[PDB]
Symmetry: C2
Subunit: 57 residues, 2 copies
């Protein structure tokens, strides 16, 4: 019913990533994401990020 932890799957620059929920935004409307293909964390303007899926961690 209930997800205890969730992964917010997104896309940025054509690549699958997830939002890092526990890292503060660097600027208004931005967030840190982690790309799935290399595990690197980077800042993104949320206006340029598409939501893909919500699944259990």
């Amino acid at each position: 019913d209930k997800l205890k932890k969730a992964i917010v799957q997104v896309e940025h620059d054509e690549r699958p990533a997830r939002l890092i929920l526990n890292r503060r935004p660097p600027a208004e409307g931005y967030a840190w994401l982690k790309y799935e293909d290399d595990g690197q964390e980077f800042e993104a303007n949320l206006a340029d990020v598409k939501l893909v899926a919500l699944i259990e961690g």
Copy 2:
């Protein structure tokens, strides 16, 4: 202290309900800030706005 993921649907602010399982892949449950109504949305039609971190 839970994270809050702020979005917009039909130009109205809302949040993703992070603790409720979606019924279908690429969909989710959202709650409008203005009336508290919970509803199903296709994430393709949902704009991400801000993160309040956990």
